[PDB]
């Protein structure tokens, strides 16, 4: 099946001073957002009609309450221990946790934490593993948290028992959107001149879904190895944008074409031809 194969939640907790901290959170299928977190209410925002997957409204409300208590408690405890952990304000903590479906069917869970934009800890085999970037502070944190009754256990349940069944249920519940096929459009333009006597040609590809796509500059059936793929960029409403560039000498741009392949085109590639002398 196509589309996303993983689910995760993220946390960004920004500690401005010893009496002010705020958290942002959200839920995602790969890089498609399916949940928001509303700090006004301490409840989730369900961005798709299928965002609860196969979970009952009661189980969803229980999980929202776990996250509400966790968000409040996290800030409370970090502010209380900030002095002992020699924390200097402002600082920012990030967390990501979830699970993913692999080839062969296994579901693997993960939890990672960061401080100052650097890795701080991870959960491997239901244990807190300090990251070397986190130094003695991460060793101190892991020794402190694993003594917390309830937290370790709740994290274990959520990662290894709740997340896998949630993931399968939501990939199934959302399949009309997650496995839809949206066709790209493509166009050509100039790029910044790489230098004297040289041009850059740009092949733009936009509005496709799912994300896997193939774009190449061509001379007839010869693929130009100089083709440079840009990073995939997002559009609003779950489609993507990509630029494929080629740097050539002024007199070598004639004869070039851009070829686009995508799962939605049913084997009917898009071919665009570059014409020189301002003829597009």
């Amino acid at each position: 099946f196509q589309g996303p194969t993983s689910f995760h939640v993220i946390q960004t907790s920004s500690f401005t001073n010893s009496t002010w901290a705020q958290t942002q959170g959200s839920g995602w299928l790969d890089d498609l957002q399916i949940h928001g977190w509303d700090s006004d209410s301490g409840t989730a925002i369900f961005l798709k009609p299928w965002s609860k997957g196969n979970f009952s409204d009661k189980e969803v409300a229980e999980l929202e309450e776990i996250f509400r208590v966790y968000i409040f408690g996290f800030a409370r405890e970090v502010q209380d221990f900030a002095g002992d952990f020699q924390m200097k304000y402002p600082f920012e903590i990030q967390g990501i946790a979830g699970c993913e479906l692999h080839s062969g069917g296994a579901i693997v869970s993960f939890l990672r934490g960061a401080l100052g934009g650097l890795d701080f800890l991870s959960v491997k085999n239901a244990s807190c593993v300090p990251s070397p970037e986190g130094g003695s502070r991460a060793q101190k944190f892991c020794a402190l948290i694993i003594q917390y009754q309830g937290i370790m256990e709740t994290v274990r349940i959520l990662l290894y028992e709740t997340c896998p069944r949630y993931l399968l249920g939501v990939l199934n519940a959302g399949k009309a959107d997650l496995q839809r096929q949206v066709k790209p459009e493509a166009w050509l333009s100039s790029g910044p001149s790489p230098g004297p006597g040289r041009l850059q040609l740009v092949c733009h590809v936009s509005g496709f879904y799912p994300k896997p796509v193939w774009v190449m500059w061509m001379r007839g059936e010869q693929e130009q190895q100089g083709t440079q793929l840009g990073d995939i960029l997002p559009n609003a409403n779950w489609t993507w944008y990509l630029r494929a560039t080629l740097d050539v000498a002024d007199g070598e741009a004639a004869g070039l074409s851009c070829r686009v392949k995508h799962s939605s085109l049913e084997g009917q590639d898009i071919i665009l031809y570059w014409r020189g002398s301002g003829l597009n």
Binding site: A114, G117, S189, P234, A236
Partner: protein, 98 residues
């Protein structure tokens, strides 16, 4: 260490003068998360701009998508203006269809 934002400005559809389109500004690679992003038309802030909820990549750098409807013309200029703790002044990146 703090990381300054990368700023990429692009249209959803090919620019056609007088035809409605969408202007995107993708801001990425930055740390810490607090950031201000505006889309500009001829140097003026566009009032109705939408944006994504905060996310971050595997290396913990944050990213956001800002977008709005716009109708390109031959004369009008569009841009993305970003403010972040790593910048002493706002950084402006102009939209350029060419």
């Amino acid at each position: 260490i703090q990381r300054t934002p990368k700023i990429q400005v692009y249209s959803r559809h090919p620019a056609e003068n007088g035809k409605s389109n969408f202007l995107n500004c993708y801001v990425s690679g930055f740390h810490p998360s607090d950031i201000e992003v505006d889309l500009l038309k001829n140097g003026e802030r566009i009032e109705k701009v939408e944006h994504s909820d905060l996310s971050f990549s595997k290396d913990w750098s944050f990213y956001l998508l800002y977008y709005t409807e716009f109708t390109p013309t031959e004369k009008d200029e569009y841009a993305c203006r970003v403010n972040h703790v790593t910048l002493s002044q706002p950084k402006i990146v102009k939209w350029d269809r060419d």
